[PDB]
Paper text:
Unlike Cas9, Cas12a directly catalyzes precursor crRNA (pre-crRNA) processing to generate a mature surveillance complex whose crRNA bears a hydroxyl on its 5’ terminus. This specific association serves to position AcrVA4 proximal to highly conformationally dynamic domains that are locked by the inhibitor to cage the enzyme in a state incompatible with dsDNA binding.
With the exception of the PAM-interacting (PI) domain, which was disordered in our structure, we resolved most of the LbCas12a protein and crRNA to high-resolution. Residues 136–233 of AcrVA4 adopt a compact ɑ1β1-β5ɑ2 fold, defined here as the C-terminal binding domain (CBD), that forms an extensive interface with LbCas12a. The 1479 Å2 of buried surface area between AcrVA4 and LbCas12a accounts for 23.8% of the total solvent accessible surface area of the CBD. While the CBD of only a single copy of AcrVA4 was well resolved in State I, AcrVA4 exists as an obligate dimer in solution that binds directly to either one or two copies of the LbCas12a-crRNA complex. Examining the EM density of our 3.0 Å reconstruction revealed a smearing of poorly defined density adjacent to the CBD most likely attributable to a flexible protomer of AcrVA4 in the absence of another LbCas12a-crRNA protomer. AcrVA4 inserts a glutamate (VA4:E178) to interact with the 5’-hydroxyl of the processed crRNA and a conserved histidine (Cas12a:H759) within the WED domain. The interface between LbCas12a and the CBD of AcrVA4 extends beyond the conserved crRNA processing nuclease to include an elongated β3-β4 loop of AcrVA4 that sits deep in a solvent accessible pocket formed between the crRNA hairpin, REC2 and RuvC domains.
Residue numbers in the entry:
A (entry chain A): 1 to 82, 91 to 246, 250 to 279, 293 to 534, 542 to 560, 576 to 581, 682 to 1074, 1085 to 1226
B (entry chain C): 136 to 233
The structure:
Amino acid sequence: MSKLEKFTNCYSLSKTLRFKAIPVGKTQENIDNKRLLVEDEKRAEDYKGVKKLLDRYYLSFINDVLHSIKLKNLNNYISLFRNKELENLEINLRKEIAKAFKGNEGYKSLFKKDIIETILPEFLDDKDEIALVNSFNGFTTAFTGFFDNRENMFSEEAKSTSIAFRCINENLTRYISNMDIFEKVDAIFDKHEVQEIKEKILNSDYDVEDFFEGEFFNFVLTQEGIDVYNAIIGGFVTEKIKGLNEYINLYNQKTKQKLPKFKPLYKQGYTSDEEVLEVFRNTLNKNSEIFSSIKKLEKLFKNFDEYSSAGIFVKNGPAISTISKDIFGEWNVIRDKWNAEYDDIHLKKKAVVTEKYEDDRRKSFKKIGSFSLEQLQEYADADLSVVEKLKEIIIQKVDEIYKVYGSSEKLFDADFVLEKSLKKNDAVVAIMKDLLDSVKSFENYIKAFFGEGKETNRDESFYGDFVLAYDILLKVDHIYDAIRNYVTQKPYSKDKFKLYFQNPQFMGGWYRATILRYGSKYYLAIMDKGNYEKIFESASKKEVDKLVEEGKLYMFQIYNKDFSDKSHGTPNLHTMYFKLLFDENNHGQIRLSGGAELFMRRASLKKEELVVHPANSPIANKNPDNPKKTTTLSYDVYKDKRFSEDQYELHIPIAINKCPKNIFKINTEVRVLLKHDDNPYVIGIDRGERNLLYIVVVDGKGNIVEQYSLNEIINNFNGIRIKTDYHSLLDKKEKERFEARQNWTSIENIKELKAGYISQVVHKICELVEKYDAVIALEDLNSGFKNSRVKVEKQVYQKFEKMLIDKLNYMVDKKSNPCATGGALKGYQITNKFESFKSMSTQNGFIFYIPAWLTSKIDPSTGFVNLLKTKYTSIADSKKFISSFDRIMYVPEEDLFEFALDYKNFSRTDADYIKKWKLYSYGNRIRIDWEEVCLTSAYKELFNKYGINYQQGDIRALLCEQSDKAFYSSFMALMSLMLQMRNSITGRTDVDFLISPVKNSDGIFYDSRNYEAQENAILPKNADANGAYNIARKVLWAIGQFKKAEDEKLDKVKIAISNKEWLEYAQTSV
Amino acid sequence: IDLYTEQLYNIIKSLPYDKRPNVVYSDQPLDPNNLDLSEPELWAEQVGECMRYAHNDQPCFYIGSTKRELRVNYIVPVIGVRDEIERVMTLEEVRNLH
RNA sequence: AAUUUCUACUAAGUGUAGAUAAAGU
Ligand SMILES: [Mg+2]
Ligand SMILES: [Mg+2]
């Protein structure tokens, strides 16, 4: 009656097993004597040509349909735009565009065989490229993806890349702002002046004012319309003709007034070190478009005060935190000033600050679009001008850019020659990365001042210039990505091309392809235009080998190192799947669905580059936790031998559980089973600071069943058992990154190492789940933070959660008998399919996502948690603090100091449940540069140093009489480190204990150092065990909630445990 | 020359990876008897693997991790961590390492 | 440092342990 045993055969699943095909007999020379690998390589190289031709025809069709289109909703848009009566109308507009597209009499052909068969061989009419578009005749399937991507532009889903979104959300806004700017900036113009020459040279038929009319936007939908409009905006040679923006610049230089300039509309990998370096020299030299953008933005941001401060803006998000850090001291000052001004309106005279109130305040803030500069000036102090500080920090960033340019004069000079290859040269890559990093830091910084766009009183005099420069500056993103992806590139390559064998309908079923098998060798037989076993009518090996010798057959051997004869360990998972395709115990579980695909990868490593470990020479072993410290093999070990030859990859799809029967909802069955269960286990996983991942398995009553670090993965094999310390490997990689000139390659190596690590942790957690029938407990990554010391960051932890979901969709034990529950044929399906990184929340089958609030800095034996705010600010606040304690006395028996507080008398302490805590000065704390401090001795020292008796009792009144400014500073300092539970020496020394200042019912303070020297411990051994323990106890609370509800209201039980309920549970569970 | 680097290969091939020296790498031959620092191309990093070219059995060294693919042909051990190189070790100060 | 491929290897000597949904954009 176990839980997991009910979650087999739930739903269907699909995978592609990749193998390697080895030509058998004289198949390779029968292929080279028919040249069946040049037609297909030629087709793979002409794919890009036909892609460009199809793009050209698509562009023609787009510019055709965007002429026969006139909207009826645009005048209403312009009339109502210059907050909810407009979005319906604009989606109506985008729907109108998309209907104009999908309503043409030729849209049917755009993504089917007709556009390669009939249309494009006519639209082109060039005997050179009609050859291309006729070569792919019958091979329409080779475009299946391309079309499915080249239609998301003809749609209206308003994603950043679509024609409707471009024309409406990004173009019409600029057109309307241009209408405003033309109505405002006029009469510095004349027909005698440059207006008539503008008209004659660029339009020649109708007036120029017509392009600032409202319903004349249905002319700039076509790229040539955008071109003529942007021409009359900026200036278009036919005789260099000046445009309106430089006529404005000519006016603003005649007399001094910052008059707004128009905004132009939008328009709807490298392969050699020399190409990379010349692209760098071209785009980023000291006279490029980008350096000119930087100079323009410098002159703008240094002329930053002659623009009306009420008009500038700053977007709301990370930009606000960074701006406060750079201006108002540190991270949260703007947020707390806004919170003060929000309490002064939405908070009564009471101290009733509730988590619902705090959450609604946070939501109202996070929904604020952007902050003006006058607002951010009101939040400031006396004699602090926010625009001066912004100007000085931006000018500092620009001067730092110029300095980095001054460190790199040589990569721009024509004399420069490359000594080494780019991937092996790291002085020049250091130069390139430093330049790109400085410029992109500037780009990401000034990205803030584009404050949400949709707002009324934008100072267009500033934003004209700003967007003119920034829309040229943001090409550094693509340049950076291209150069980086070129440098962090493996010396081999995995570029392949599918082989068809003169047959469009090839291998698409079980076609001219079959999977034979003989003994323990599985073969892929492809007919062209002893005894085996067909997949079961037999054959004769003699006559099939005769066919192979003739040429009527192309027998490949499916092979990976588990089909080898020298392989003795456990096979791969997909090898077991394949071998099971043809088994008897396999009824319909893993079946052969779809058609295979025979690719072909050419040799990427030149045999002059192959590097080898010479035979009969002792090789050093890289694993420090290995007993055997060398290895001597009787043969050679080539590095990357697989990429030094041509290889016929073979992709075989399989459909697991094609005909499921135990169909139901997984979440509700999990809830029912956790309810009806009397002792459900829970695996809490947590990201530690000294441990990559930390596991704590807790039974149904809060008792720790197991707790251990996942730093080192332990591989069992042949009965032997060898461990690998991934924390040490990661520390080595981080040290290497610290040593290297540039860290583009080091970062990719670290990322891929972490991906491999989580691929090991996946198996660890699965074998933990199928041992206890447990339920996983994971941090909810949407809400929360890990303070930058946590090794596994959020990206790789998201990848870990995704990998765990994707594994638990079909959990398999490789060692188990296949037909047995948990084996490859009957794996557990205890999780739903992955959907998105945002829907990973609040449940997924056996996985519960839990907020990580108050999990590591909480006493695990009493539930205590430091909800105070013990930071020194002034004499008055500290005096009120000291006077808010119920009692502060020196207990002489224990030689301690009792601070009997009561969280009711303190602000923002509503979550607490046992509101009356009594916390002492027990133990020693490590402050931070670190220093150990014995607390009672520090208190006695401070008291005596400031002239204070303490044997009296209740020395609060004796203590709030000190007139000194530094007494309260020292006092609140060591009062802050007394409530510090998680103590850890910064310099990596593994001392991460966790002491608590309150004593439990039995009268002993929890100290992790009393449990780290133990196996079979009842309380967490360190701070990370505490984190995992609490993340598990939250799911235990949710299980109790399930037990409280009925068997129909289970589906509605909310399990996002709130701080109030969590502290109540943690403080009464004991 | 080649003999110094052949001896260096035979020595460094046997040390455990955590003991390997810090070296200055390049692809044209490096002459420790004459190698002078202060050149803005000498960066002291730590040797990784030590393998042989398959076509002519010339020793090559992977600086840092093998997965980093910074394979060089000529190294020289130094007492240094960064662009701040102190001095050049000898063919016996590298044997003293383990 | 060998791989369908990735990660860590050498793991008892042409491999070991885990993971692996490919194609297309
Ligand atoms: Mg194996
Ligand atoms: Mg490797």
